[PDB]
Curated annotation (Swiss-Prot), chain A:
Belongs to the TCP-1 chaperonin family. Heterooligomeric complex of about 850 to 900 kDa that forms two stacked rings, 12 to 16 nm in diameter. This is T-complex protein 1 subunit epsilon. It comes from Saccharomyces cerevisiae (strain ATCC 204508 / S288c). The lineage of its organism: Eukaryota, Fungi, Dikarya, Ascomycota, Saccharomycotina. The gene is CCT5. Molecular chaperone; assists the folding of proteins upon ATP hydrolysis. Known to play a role, in vitro, in the folding of actin and tubulin. In yeast may play a role in mitotic spindle formation. The chain holds residues 439 to 500 of 562 of the full protein. It is found in: Cytoplasm.
Curated annotation (Swiss-Prot), chain B:
Belongs to the TCP-1 chaperonin family. It comes from Saccharomyces cerevisiae (strain ATCC 204508 / S288c) (Baker's yeast). Transmembrane segments: none annotated. Present with 5530 molecules/cell in log phase SD medium. It comes from the Eukaryota. It is found in: Cytoplasm. This is T-complex protein 1 subunit delta. Molecular chaperone; assists the folding of proteins upon ATP hydrolysis. Known to play a role, in vitro, in the folding of actin and tubulin. In yeast may play a role in mitotic spindle formation. Heterooligomeric complex of about 850 to 900 kDa that forms two stacked rings, 12 to 16 nm in diameter. The lineage of its organism: Eukaryota, Fungi, Dikarya, Ascomycota, Saccharomycotina. The chain holds residues 433 to 480 of 528 of the full protein.
Amino acid sequence: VVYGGGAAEVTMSLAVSEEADKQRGIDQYAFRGFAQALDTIPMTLAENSGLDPIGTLSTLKS
Amino acid sequence: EGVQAFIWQEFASALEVIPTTLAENAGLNSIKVVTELRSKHENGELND
């Protein structure tokens, strides 16, 4: 069981960016790409609902 | 702290393509070269 509604995407996204800060290597941008790719589904819901995407993801991330 | 600032971040990120293109034409790894551009510029203000 897991609570969806865009929560599963953002909660898996911020941890990947946190791991990249110490697991930099050559694949530092690879984790950042997957972190930004997971957040697109909340932004997709923002477009269909007609809300501001940046304000939505900024509030959820904060 | 505005949406105009978020566009300026992409303005700064997209402007780094010129040394990235130089790395690919020279065969050097772009991330290793661009990582040195970030490491030397906080002290070196110009001519680096």
